[PDB]
Symmetry: C2
Subunit: 399 residues, 2 copies
C-alpha cells in the first residue's frame, strides 16, 4: 500500500478545527468563520459577464497548453505596466490556480536532494511541494520583532552547495508582511554569489497593499531577472478563487520545462476562466476602482482589528502592510488553567478553545510553521469582526 | 539547470505535425484537421445554462478540496446506477479533468521502481505519468487481428514482484476498442494471484459507445473492487473539455492519499465547472436524448470511414466499438518512395506525407506505441471526412 511521496506529507493541522466546526458540531450553534483564505467579495460583474459570455459564445474546447494568446499577451502588459518587468508571451504559463504554478516551478528546477529555502511563517504548501519534488526544505524562522521579515544574515548561514530555490511570499500569507526594496536588495546581492540559487516570488496578494507600503517584485532587482520565477494570479485580487486561474513568468527554458510538465498534470486551464482573466486584466491598472474599492474595505477592517486586539494584555500584533491576514501572538496565554481545554499551551489547543467553547474559528500558527501565533482573516464584513473581537475578549480575560 | 524527470520527458512525436498544421492553415492552405481529440459539438445548453447560472448566483469561491458534496453524491448515484458500483461520498475525488485524476492515482500508489503495465496502442500520458512517479512502464503490444485487446497470457508473462498498476482504457484511445466482460473476467483472475497489482480503469469514453458493444466497469468484477481505481469525467461525453472536470472513485485509503496530493497540486476543481457537472449528471442515464444524438452522429461518421477506407487496398481496419477514433493500418505502404518526398518508411513519414502534400493532418501511431498505424479522429463533420477520403485516395494511388 501507498507510495512514500504521499506518505511523506503530512497530517494537516487545519481539519481538526477549520472544517470540523463547519460541521454538525455547528448544530445547533452558529459560528463566525474567521479562518477562510478567500475574499468576502463577489466576482466583478464585468469579469463575471466575460465568463458568462465565453460559455454562451462556445469558448468551451481545450486551450493551448500554455494558455490563450490574448491572456498571455495581456499578462505581459500587466507585468510591464504594474511591475516594470519585460516578458514575452512564451515566458508565460497559465495553470489552474497559482498553487499549480508554484508546484510546477519546484518540480522543474529542483533535482533530488536539492534544498529549498523557506522562510517561516510559511504558506502550508511550500514545505509539501518541495517534498513532492524530492527536495529538502530548509526552514528559516523569523521573529515578530522583525515584522516576520527574513534576516539576511540568517539566509547567508543556510546557503549550501545544494541550495537551489528560495521562496519569498510578499505580501505574505499568513503574516501580511511586505518586503522593503532595501531588504530585498541585500537578499539579492547574496543570491548573486550563489551559482545555483533561484527565487520563487509569490506575488498573489500584490494589489492588496496598504498605506506607505509598496510591492516591489523581485525580478525587477539588478541581476535577478534571470534567477526569478514570478507567480501571480486572479484568486485574491479579483475575488476569483473558484475560477482557478494563476500564472508564472520567468526564464524561457524554465517556463518551457514547466509547460511540458503541465501537459502531463492537468492540461491547459479552463477556457472559461481564461476569458474571464482577460476581462479582469481589462478592468485597468489597479486593476481599477473595483479592486481599489475592496482594498479600502480591507484597510478599514485591518485598522479595527489592530486597534481592538492589540490593547488586550499579552497579545502582540504587528501592523500588517498587505493581504488580509493578522498573525496574532496569543502566546503568554499558554499557561492558562483554563477550563475544559486542560493545558491550553498550543496554538492548536488555543485555537480549539476559541472555537468549540466561544464559536470563533481561526487557523493555528501550527499550520504555518510558527506555533507562537494564530492566523485571523479579516476578509469579512465589519459587523462580524466586532462580534469576533467580542468573543475573543470574553475568551481571554478568564485567564 | 533543470532536474531529471523534467529532462526524462523530452519526446513528443505529436509536436511537429498536429500542432504545426495549425500553423500552415494560419496562412494560405486550408487543412482538414483529423487530429482532434475533442468533440466537435457545443456543450449541452442545459449544462451551459447551469454554469452560467452558477456564475450569476455567485458560486465563485473555493469548494471543498475533494469536491462539492452535491456533485460527489450525484457521481455515486451515476456509478451505482450506470455501472453497478457502490461508493460512498468520501470515496470520490473531483479534479480539473481526468488527466489530473490519473496522475494523482499513479503518484499515490506507485513506489520508485514499481512497474506500471500499459497495453499498447496507448494514450501518451500513461507512460509520462508513470515516469513522473519513478515507476517503470512496461508496454505490452497488442495486434490489430485481436482488435488491439490485451492478451491475458501476454499479461502473465510480464507480471512480476514489482507489478503495481495495470492501466486499462476502454473504450480506447487511440484504437477505439471495448473490452468484453469475458476478456475482462479472464484478466481479473490473472491479477488476483498478484498481491500488489492494482487496476486503473480509464472509463472516460464510457458513453461514446456503439450499439452491440457494452461497457463493463472493471470494479464490477468479483474480487476487483478492492484493487480498482475508476476514472471517469465530463470532457468527452458532454463536450465539456474546456471546463476541466473529472473524478476518481476507489478504496477509501487510496482516495484519501490522492486527496492529500490534490491539496498540494491544484486545490479543488472549478466551482463553476462542478455545478455544470451536476446538470450533466442530472441529464439522465445515457444521459437521455442529449448524449444519444451525438452518439448517433458519431456512429454514422465511423461507418462512413470504415467502409470508405476499408475499400482502399493496403488499408486494414478493425471496426471500433467506442470513442471517436480510428486506428488505421496503412502499413504495406511502408517501403515505398514517393516523389520527391522521398521515403515512406514509417507512420511518422506517412503522417507527414498526408499533411503538407495532400493537406491532411493525422497523428502517427508512433505517438501511441504502435508504429503500424495512423490515428484518425472522426469528431468532425461528414463533409470534411469525404474531402479527406478523396485526398487519402489521391495520396495512396501514387505508390
Ligand atoms: C500565499 C499563497 N500563494 C498562492 C496561493 C494560490 O492561490 P490559487 O491556487 O487559488 O490561485 C494562495 C491561495 C496563497 O494564499
Ligand atoms: C483516453 C483519455 N483519458 C483521459 C483523458 C483526460 O480527460 P480530461 O480532459 O477531462 O482531463 C483524455 C483526454 C483521454 O483521451
Amino acid at each position: 500500500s501507498l507510495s512514500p511521496r504521499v506518505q511523506s506529507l503530512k497530517p494537516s493541522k487545519t481539519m481538526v478545527i477549520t472544517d470540523l466546526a463547519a460541521t454538525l458540531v455547528q448544530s445547533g450553534v452558529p459560528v463566525i468563520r474567521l479562518a477562510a483564505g478567500e475574499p468576502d467579495f463577489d466576482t466583478p460583474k464585468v469579469v463575471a459577464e466575460a465568463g458568462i459570455n465565453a460559455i454562451r459564445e462556445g469558448f468551451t474546447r481545450y486551450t493551448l497548453n500554455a494558455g490563450i494568446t490574448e491572456l498571455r499577451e495581456a499578462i505581459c502588459r500587466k507585468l510591464k505596466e504594474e511591475n516594470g518587468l519585460s516578458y514575452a508571451p512564451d515566458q508565460i504559463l497559465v495553470s489552474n490556480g497559482a498553487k499549480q504554478s508554484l508546484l510546477q516551478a519546484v518540480l522543474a528546477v529542483c533535482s533530488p536532494g536539492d534544498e529549498v529555502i523557506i522562510p517561516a511563517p510559511y504558506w502550508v504548501s511550500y514545505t509539501e511541494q518541495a517534498r513532492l519534488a524530492d527536495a529538502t526544505p530548509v526552514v528559516i524562522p523569523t521573529k515578530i520583532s522583525n515584522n516576520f521579515l527574513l534576516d539576511p544574515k540568517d539566509l547567508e548561514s543556510k546557503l549550501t552547495e545544494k541550495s537551489r530555490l528560495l521562496i519569498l511570499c510578499s505580501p505574505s500569507n499568513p503574516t501580511g508582511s511586505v518586503y522593503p526594496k532595501s531588504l530585498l536588495e541585500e537578499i539579492a546581492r547574496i543570491i548573486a554569489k550563489h551559482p545555483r540559487l533561484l527565487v520563487l516570488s509569490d506575488e498573489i496578494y500584490e494589489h492588496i497593499i496598504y498605506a506607505p507600503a509598496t510591492h516591489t517584485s523581485f525580478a525587477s532587482l539588478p541581476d535577478m531577472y534571470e534567477r526569478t520565477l514570478t507567480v501571480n494570479g486572479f484568486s485574491k485580487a479579483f475575488a476569483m478563487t473558484g475560477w482557478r486561474l494563476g500564472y508564472l513568468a520567468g526564464p524561457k527554458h524554465i517556463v518551457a520545462a514547466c509547460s511540458k510538465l503541465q501537459g502531463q498534470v492537468s492540461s491547459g486551464a479552463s477556457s472559461i476562466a481564461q476569458k474571464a482573466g482577460v476581462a479582469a486584466l481589462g478592468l485597468g491598472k489597479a486593476g481599477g476602482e473595483t479592486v481599489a474599492e475592496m482594498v479600502k474595505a480591507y484597510r478599514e477592517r485591518r485598522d479595527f482589528l489592530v486597534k481592538s486586539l492589540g490593547d488586550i494584555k499579552g497579545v502582540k500584533i504587528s501592523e500588517p502592510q498587505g493581504a488580509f491576514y493578522l498573525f496574532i501572538d496569543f502566546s503568554a496565554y499558554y499557561g492558562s488553567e483554563a477550563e475544559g481545554f486542560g493545558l491550553i499551551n498550543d496554538s492548536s489547543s488555543l485555537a480549539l478553545y476559541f472555537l468549540d467553547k466561544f464559536q470563533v474559528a481561526m487557523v493555528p500558527g501550527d499550520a504555518f510553521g510558527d506555533d507562537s501565533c494564530i492566523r485571523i482573516s479579516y476578509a469579512t464584513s465589519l459587523d462580524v469582526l466586532q462580534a469576533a473581537v467580542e468573543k475573543i475578549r470574553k475568551a481571554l480575560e478568564p485567564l
